[PDB]
C-alpha cells in the first residue's frame, strides 16, 4: 500500500494543481499497490476558499492510479479553478490481498455520510472486530469490510465524547491509537480541524517532507509529552508532504522527517510538531526513480546492473591491494568470527540470494550456513542460540515475516546482521549491524538488481571473514578479480538481449517450463522459475538437477520445455549427466552454458552462451538471461512487467 | 539387474522342476524392470544325470520372463523328465547398459562356443575396454557388445593358463575380480567344475539362501584367506539359492547369508565356503514373507502399498512403542542413544521422498530435541562440501539403502567423525551396514515404483526417535503422551482416510484433463505439498508443484486465476489462521481451490465447494493423513489416463 498527502499553507494552489499532486504522488507509490486508489479533498465551488473546508469530497475507484486519475477528471460538479490558500489533500493506493478492490473498500475511509473524519491506513488493525462491535453498539453504522473503517468511526467517537470544546486534533488521535492494536500509518483530515493534518505510525513507515523558500525554525523537532515547532521564520508560506515512501517526496524536496513508533506528528496553523526527531537530507536523486529511456522499470533495473553492482562495491572493494572493508561491519566483524553458525533468513528472491551464496559462505567461513524461508522459520520455532549470527536479507527492509524473524532471533540473544536496500527501514534499524547494498531504489515489482546486489554484498562479507587465512589468499584474489571484471561481463550478457527475445518467441505459447541446475546454479533455477511465474504467469518450476532421477524426470518429453544451466565448475560432469538424461527422455532443452563449452554448444540446438567467471560469481551471469527471458515472455503474452497481477512489491503485512 | 541360481545337491529334481524354479525366481525380480532374460542349465538327455554335466545349455531371449518360459517349454531334443541328483541352474534378468537388448547380449554370457564357463552379472565393468582388448590379443573372440562377456572370456583365460591341474574354481574367480573394475554381482558356472557354484560381489547386492531337512554345521561361516564351512552334518541333502534380492529366495527359505565386497563364496561337494584375498558371515533369519511381495486381491503394487499403510505403520511401531506405560524403545539405538543425546546438531540427508520425510519431521525433531535440525538434499549436500563436525548426528533416510548420493554423503560424514544413523528399509544394505547405528523401519519390501508406505514409515520412525530424545524431560511428558496416543489411533485414522477413496476418485475426474496443479501448504504440511506434487509428477506425468503457502504473496500467487487447479492443505494446528489467509488470497484472485481439511472444520467446508475431509490428529502426525489423499489422487489419475502405475519410466 501507499500513503501520500499534500498540505499547502499560504501557497496558493488551484484545485487542479492539488489533485495532480495527489495523483502524481500515488503514481510514485503505485508499485506498492495497484488494485484500487482514492483521494480526499475539500469540496464546494465557493470562490472564497475559507467557505469550502467544511465539505470533504472523496473520489475512489477500482483499478490502478490511471483509473483514478480518469475518475478525478471529467467530473461535472467539481470546479477545478478555485484557488486554495490553505488546503489538505490525502490519497492512498491499496493492495487488496483480501475481499474485493472496490471503491467502498478503498481509502480514505470515512466516519459518517458527511465526511467529518477521513483516514488513510497502511497496515492491519488486529482488533478491529472488537472496535467494530463496540462502535456499532454506540450507534455507528458501518459500510465496508475493511479494518480501516474502525479507525474513522473511532476518531469521531472520541470527538463526540470530548470533555472540552477545544480538544486538539492530536488529543483525539492519541486516544484512538491507544485503542488500536497491530500496525498502522495514518494521516487524518477533519472538517472540524480545517487545514490540519495528523500523522502517526506504529510499525509502518511514515515521513514528512517539508519545502519552504523561507528559513525553517529548526532542524531537530523536539518530542512532547502529555521554540518547539517546525515552521518558516518570518513568513507563513510552507508546504508539507506526508508519504509512506521517499520516492513520492524526492521530486518536491529532499528534507524529510522520519517519524518513529508512537510519534504523533501534527500540522496546526502551518506549524509541524511531534507529540508522544531529526530532519534528515535524503541522498536519493530524482533520476533514480525515473525510467529514463526504458519503456519499463524492470528493463531499466535489469540493464543497469553493471552500474548497480559497481555501486554496491563502491568504497568497499580495493582491487589494487585486494582488500575488502564493509564499513557497517567494522565494529562487529571480530565478534562475528567468534560465532559458530550463520543463519540466512529472507523471503522470495531475497531467500534465493542466500541459496546462491550459501556455498561460498561455507567455504570461506568454514561455519555451518543455514538458509531459511522466514515464514517457515517462524512456523517451526527454529532453535536459535546466543552464538548464532543471523542475517536478514530484505530489499525493502519491511517484509513482515523477515522482520518477525529478526525480532525472534534478537530475543534469543543472537547477533543480527542486515543486508538491506532501504536506509530507514525496520530491519536496518533493529539489526545490530548490516550492509546497505546501495543498489538504488527498485521500482519494478520483481526484484532484479536487488538480487545481484545482495549476491555481491554477501560475497564481500565472505571475503572479509577469511582475510586472515594464508591458505585462502589466492582464492580471495581469484574472486576479487572476478568482481573487477563482473560489470563488463554483465554488459556482455545484456548484449545477447535480442538472442534471448528470439527464444522467448519459441516459448511464450507454452504452459510450463522446467529450469534445472545444481550447485552454484540451484538458486539460479529457483530465481528464474520465480521470475517467470511472477511476470509471465507461465508455470515455471526450478528443479535441482541431481533430483531428476528421483521422480521429476518423468515429466520430461519432447513436448515439455526445459531450460538447463551447465557451467564450467566442479559440477560440470554431473550437469552433463542430467542433460543426457533429459535428452534420453526426448527433451529438447535450452542450455545456458559457457562460451568456451564447445561440447555443449555443438550437441545442443539452442544455447545461451555467457562469458566465463569465477564459479562463486557465475550465478550472477546465469540469472540475468532468465531475468530477460521473463521480460520478453511477458511482452509477447501482452502483460505489463512493472505491475504483475495478484500482488505488489514488498510484503509488509500478513 | 536380477540374479537367481538354484543349486540342488543330493535333492533329486527333474529338469522340469529345475527350470520352473529358475523362472519362478526371475518372476520375483521383474518388478525392478528389465529388457531380457535367460537361463543356463545342463543340456543332454542321458538318463544318467552325471554324463550331462559336460554340456551347458543357454536359453536367452529379448522380452519378458513369460516369453522366456514359453521358449523353455518349446525346445525339442530336450527331455524335461531327466532326474538330476545334483545340478546348478542360473538365471538372469537384464537391464541393458552396454549393447542393445538381444539374445547375444542377454545373460548368461559364455566363454566360448561350447559354454565351458557361463556367468550372470549385475552392474558395469568400467574397464571392459582394456579387458576386451587384452583378451582379443590372446586369441579370444567376442560375440556381444556387453561388458559382461569380458568376464566369461577372462575366467577361461585364467583357466587355460592355470599352473596346476586342480586349481579351484574360487582361485579362477579370485584372479578375475582382481582384474575387474567397477560394480558387479556375479555367479559362475562351468563344465570343468560340475555342480559347483561361485558367487562374488563388489558394490552390488548378492546373498545365498540355504535349505535342508538336516542340521547345518554352523550359523556363522568363517572366512578363509589365500567348523570351516556350511553343510548338512549327517547327510548330503541341501539346497542353495544365490540371488541379488531376497524376494526370489523367501518362498523357499528364510535362512540367508549376505555377502560383502570381495567375498568369493563357493559351493564344492555341496558345502558352502567363503574366501577372501575370526571374521565370518552369519546365517540369519529374514523376517520376510512371500505375501509381502505379491499383489493379492489388489490390481497393482501401488494400490496395495497405499491401502496396507494401516498395517505397515503398525509394523513400524511393533516392539518399539509401549502403549501400556507409554514408552518408546528403538532396539537399534540402545547402544548409541546416550551418545546421540550429547551431540549438538542433527543433519538429515536423503533424496527424493526420503528427503520429504525429513522435511515432514523437522519441526517435531526441533521441538523435542531442542537441537538444530538441518535437512539436506544429498546431491546438493555433496556439491557444497557442507561443513560437518565430530559432534554432528547425521541421519540417512533411504528405503533401498543403496542410493548413490545418500551413500556418498554417509561416507563423507563418516570421514569428518560424525555419528551416523540410518533410517532404512533394506536389511544388509550399504547404508544400514556402513552407518554406526540405525532403525529398520520394517515397512516390508516396497515393490511399487513410487515410495508410499516407505514415506509414512520413515515419518513414524523419525517421530519415535524424537520421543526417545525427550524421554527424560518432565516438561515434555504431556506432549509425549499426546503424540503416542496419536500413534495409537493412527492406524484407524488411516483406514478412515482410505474410506474416502470414492471422494478422491471424483477429484481425479476433475483433474483428468488438467496439465498443472498447485499444492499449497505450510508448517507440518510443507512436506505434504512437496511429496504429493512429486507423486503426481512421477505417476501421472502432469506438472504438479508444491508451493509454501507463506511464499504466495512473494511471487507465485501470480499463477492463480480461474483456470489454474489448486489444492490447499488447511489443518487445525497453530498455522490455521495463516492458512485461512492463504485461502482468502487465492479466492480473491478468482482461484477456486480444493481443500484438504479437518473432518470437523465446519467453516472451511461450507465456504469451499470440493473438500477432502480427513480426521483430526496430533499436529505432528497430521502429515501422514494429509498425504495419503494425494497418494490416491496420483494413483487414480494415472489409472484414468490409461497408465500402468507399476511400470517404471
Ligand atoms: C550514512 C550511511 O548510510 N553510510 C555511510 C558509510 O557507508 P557504509 O557502507 O560504511 O555503512 P552502511 O550504509 O552499510 O550502514 C550504515 C550503518 O547502518 C547500519 N546498518 C545498515 C544496514 C542494515 O541492514 N542494518 C544496520 O544496522 C550499519 O551497521 C552501519 O553502522 O560510509 C560512506 C562514505 O561515503 C557513506 O555511505 C556514508 O558516510
Ligand atoms: C535386522 C535385524 O535382525 N533386526 C532384529 C532386531 O530389530 P531391532 O529393532 O532391535 O534393530 P534394527 O532391525 O532396526 O537394526 C538392527 C541393527 O542394524 C543396525 N542398523 C539398522 C538400520 C540402519 O539403517 N543402520 C544400522 O546400523 C541397528 O543399529 C541395529 O544394531 O531385533 C528384533 C527383535 O527384538 C528382531 O525382530 C529383528 O529381526
Ligand atoms: O521477484 C520477486 C520479489 O522480489 C519477491 O520475491 C521479494 O523479494 C519478496 O516478496 C520480499 O523481498 P524483500 O524482503 O527484499 O523486500
Ligand atoms: O517416488 C519417488 C521415490 O520414492 C524416490 O523419491 C526415492 O525416494 C529416491 O529416489 C531414493 O529413495 P531411497 O534412498 O529411499 O531408496
Ligand atoms: N552391464 C551388464 C549388466 C547390466 C545389468 O543387468 O545390471 C549388461 O549390460 O549386460
Ligand atoms: Mg541498526
Ligand atoms: Mg550398521
Curated annotation (Swiss-Prot), chain B:
Residue span of region Isomerase: 278-639
InterPro entries for this protein: GATase_2_dom, GFAT, GFAT_N, GlmS/AgaS_SIS, GlmS/FrlB_SIS, Ntn_hydrolases_N, SIS_dom, SIS_dom_sf
GO biological process: circadian regulation of gene expression; energy reserve metabolic process; fructose 6-phosphate metabolic process; protein N-linked glycosylation; UDP-N-acetylglucosamine biosynthetic process; UDP-N-acetylglucosamine metabolic process
GO CC terms in record: cytosol; extracellular exosome
Reactions this protein catalyses: D-fructose 6-phosphate + L-glutamine = D-glucosamine 6-phosphate + L-glutamate
SIS domain ranges (all copies): 336-475, 507-648
UniProt entry keywords in alphabetical sequence: Aminotransferase, Biological rhythms, Congenital myasthenic syndrome, Disease variant, Glutamine amidotransferase, Phosphoprotein, Repeat, Transferase
Domain Glutamine amidotransferase type-2: start-end pairs: 1-270
Pathway: Nucleotide-sugar biosynthesis; UDP-N-acetyl-alpha-D-glucosamine biosynthesis; alpha-D-glucosamine 6-phosphate from D-fructose 6-phosphate: step 1/1
Binding site for substrate: 353-354, 398-400, 403, 554
EC number(s) from the headed UniProt entry: 2.6.1.16
GO MF assignments: carbohydrate derivative binding; glutamine-fructose-6-phosphate transaminase (isomerizing) activity
Disulfide bonding pattern of the chain: none
Uppermost EC category: transferase
Positions bearing Phosphoserine: 102
Entry comment describing in which tissues the protein is expressed: Isoform 1 is predominantly expressed in skeletal muscle. Not expressed in brain. Seems to be selectively expressed in striated muscle.
Residues annotated as the enzyme's active site: 1
Keyword Transferase attached: yes
Gene3D superfamilies linked to this entry: Glucose-6-phosphate isomerase like protein, domain 1, Glutamine Phosphoribosylpyrophosphate, subunit 1, domain 1
UniProt disease annotation: Myasthenic syndrome, congenital, 12: A form of congenital myasthenic syndrome, a group of disorders characterized by failure of neuromuscular transmission, including pre-synaptic, synaptic, and post-synaptic disorders that are not of autoimmune origin. Clinical features are easy fatigability and muscle weakness. CMS12 is characterized by onset of proximal muscle weakness in the first decade. Individuals with this condition have a recognizable pattern of weakness of shoulder and pelvic girdle muscles, and sparing of ocular or facial muscles.
Protein role: Controls the flux of glucose into the hexosamine pathway. Most likely involved in regulating the availability of precursors for N- and O-linked glycosylation of proteins. Regulates the circadian expression of clock genes BMAL1 and CRY1. Has a role in fine tuning the metabolic fluctuations of cytosolic UDP-GlcNAc and its effects on hyaluronan synthesis that occur during tissue remodeling.
Quaternary organization: Homotetramer, may also exist as homodimers.
Protein name, UniProt field: Glutamine--fructose-6-phosphate aminotransferase [isomerizing] 1
Source species of the chain: Homo sapiens (Human)
Protein's gene: GFPT1
Amino acid at each position: 500500500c501507499g500513503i501520500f498527502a499534500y498540505l499547502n499553507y499560504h501557497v496558493p494552489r488551484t484545485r487542479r494543481e492539488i489533485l495532480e499532486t495527489l495523483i502524481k504522488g500515488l503514481q510514485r507509490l503505485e508499485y506498492r499497490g495497484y488494485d484500487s486508489a482514492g483521494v480526499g479533498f475539500d469540496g464546494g465551488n465557493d470562490k472564497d476558499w475559507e467557505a469550502n473546508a467544511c465539505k470533504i469530497q472523496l473520489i475512489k475507484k477500482k483499478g490502478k492510479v490511471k483509473a483514478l486519475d480518469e475518475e478525478v477528471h471529467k467530473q461535472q460538479d467539481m470546479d477545478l479553478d478555485i484557488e486554495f490558500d490553505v488546503h489538505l489533500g490525502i490519497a492512498h493506493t491499496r493492495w487488496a490481498t483480501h475481499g474485493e478492490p472496490s471503491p467502498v473498500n478503498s481509502h480514505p475511509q470515512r466516519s459518517d455520510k458527511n465526511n467529518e473524519f477521513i483516514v488513510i491506513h497502511n497496515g492491519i488493525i488486529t482488533n478491529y472486530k472488537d472496535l467494530k462491535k463496540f462502535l456499532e453498539s454506540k450507534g455507528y453504522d458501518f459500510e465496508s469490510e475493511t479494518d480501516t473503517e474502525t479507525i474513522a468511526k473511532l476518531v469521531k467517537y472520541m470527538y463526540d465524547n470530548r470533555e472540552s470544546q477545544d480538544t486538539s486534533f492530536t488529543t483525539l488521535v492519541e486516544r484512538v491509537i491507544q485503542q488500536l492494536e497491530g500496525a498502522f500509518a495514518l494521516v487524518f483530515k477533519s472538517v472540524h480541524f480545517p487545514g490540519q493534518a495528523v500523522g502517526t505510525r506504529r510499525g509502518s513507515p511514515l515521513l514528512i517532507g517539508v519545502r519552504s523558500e523561507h528559513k525553517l525554525s529548526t532542524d531537530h523537532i523536539p518530542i512532547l509529552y502529555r521554540t518547539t515547532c517546525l515552521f518558516p521564520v518570518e513568513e507563513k508560506a510552507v508546504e508539507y508532504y506526508f508519504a509512506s515512501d521517499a520516492s513520492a517526496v524526492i521530486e518536491h524536496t529532499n528534507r524529510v522527517i522520519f517519524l518513529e513508533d508512537d510519534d504523533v506528528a501534527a500540522v496546526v496553523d502551518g506549524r509541524l510538531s511531534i507529540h508522544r526527531r531529526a530532519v534528515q537530507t535524503l541522498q536519493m536523486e530524482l533520476q533514480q526513480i525515473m525510467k529514463g529511456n526504458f519503456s519499463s522499470f524492470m528493463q531499466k533495473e535489469i540493464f543497469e546492473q553493471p552500474e548497480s553492482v559497481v555501486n554496491t562495491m563502491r568504497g568497499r572493494v580495493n582491487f589494487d591491494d585486494y582488500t575488502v572493508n564493509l564499513g557497517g561491519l567494522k565494529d562487529h566483524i571480530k565478534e562475528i568470527q567468534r560465532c559458530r553458525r550463520l543463519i540466512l533468513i529472507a523471503c522470495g528472491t531475497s531467500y534465493h540470494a542466500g541459496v546462491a551464496t550459501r556455498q561460498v559462505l561455507e567455504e570461506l567461513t568454514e561455519l555451518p550456513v543455514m538458509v531459511e524461508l522466514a515464514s517457515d522459520f517462524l512456523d517451526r520455532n527454529t532453535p536459535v542460540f546466543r552464538d548464532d549470527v543471523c542475517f536478514f536479507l530484505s530489499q525493502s527492509g519491511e517484509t513482515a515475516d523477515t522482520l518477525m524473524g529478526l525480532r525472534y532471533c534478537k530475543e534469543r540473544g543472537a547477533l543480527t546482521v542486515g543486508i538491506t536496500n532501504t536506509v530507514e527501514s525496520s530491519i536496518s534499524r533493529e539489526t545490530d549491524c548490516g550492509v546497505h547494498i546501495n543498489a538504488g531504489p527498485e521500482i519494478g515489482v520483481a526484484s532484479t538488481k536487488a538480487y545481484t546486489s545482495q549476491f555481491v554484498s554477501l560475497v564481500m562479507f565472505a571475503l572479509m571473514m577469511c582475510d586472515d587465512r594464508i591458505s585462502m589468499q589466492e582464492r580471495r584474489k581469484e574472486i576479487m578479480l572476478g568482481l573487477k571484471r563482473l560489470p563488463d561481463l554483465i554488459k556482455e550478457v545484456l548484449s545477447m538481449d535480442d538472442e534471448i527475445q528470439k527464444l522467448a518467441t519459441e516459448l511464450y505459447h507454452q504452459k510450463s517450463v522446467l529450469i534445472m541446475g545444481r550447485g552454484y546454479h540451484y538458486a539460479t533455477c529457483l530465481e528464474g522459475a520465480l521470475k517467470i511465474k511472477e511476470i509471465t504467469y507461465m508455470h515455471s518450476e526450478g528443479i535441482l538437477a541431481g533430483e531428476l532421477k528421483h521422480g521429476p524426470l518423468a515429466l520430461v518429453d519432447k513436448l515439455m520445455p526445459v531450460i538447463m544451466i551447465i557451467m564450467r565448475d566442479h559440477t560440470y560432469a554431473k550437469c552433463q549427466n542430467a542433460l543426457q538424461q533429459v535428452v534420453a527422455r526426448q527433451g529438447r532443452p535450452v542450455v545456458i552454458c559457457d562460451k568456451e563449452d564447445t561440447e555443449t554448444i555443438k550437441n545442443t540446438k539452442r544455447t545461451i552462451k555467457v562469458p566465463h567467471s569465477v564459479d562463486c560469481l557465475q550465478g550472477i551471469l546465469s540469472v540475468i538471461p532468465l531475468q530477460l527471458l521473463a521480460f520478453h515472455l511477458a511482452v509477447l503474452r501482452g502483460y505489463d512487467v512493472d505491475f504483475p497481477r495478484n500482488l505488489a512489491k514488498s510484503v509488509t503485512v500478513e
